[PDB]
Amino acid sequence: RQLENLVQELSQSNMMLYKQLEMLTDPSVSNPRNTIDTKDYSTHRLYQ
Amino acid sequence: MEPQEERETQVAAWLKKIFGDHPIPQYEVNPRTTEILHHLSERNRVRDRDVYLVIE
Numbered sequence: 001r002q003l004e005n006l007v008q009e010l011s012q013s014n015m016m017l018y019k020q021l022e023m024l025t026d027p028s029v030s031n032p033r034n035t036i037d038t039k040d041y042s043t044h045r046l047y048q
Numbered sequence: 049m050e051p052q053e054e055r056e057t058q059v060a061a062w063l064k065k066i067f068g069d070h071p072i073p074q075y076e077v078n079p080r081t082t083e084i085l086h087h088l089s090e091r092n093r094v095r096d097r098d099v100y101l102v103i104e
């Protein structure tokens with residue numbers, strides 16, 4: 001049980017360090033800057 | 049080259065588009081009257097599509 005307590009604490013440490021990695025590696029923007037984005041439909045209307 | 053039959057067909061289709069509830073007076077059947085309004089309708093569709101794009 002005494003070792004299991006530290007196992008729980010280390011697992012808590014591992015999960016709270018797991019939860020920080022995915023926030024810094026989010027591909028929100030998905031050369032994309034050179035091309036006209038289809039989501040940016042204002043540029044599409046401008047071209048049309 | 050759109051013939052005068054297709055020209056007048058597009059004019060007839062454009063008459064109910066423009067007037068709608070407004071009455072449609074009769075035109076003299078000659079190539080001049082059919083020819084002039086064709087360019088007006090052709091550019092009116094273009095500018096209305098463009099203004100649709102601007103509004104959206």
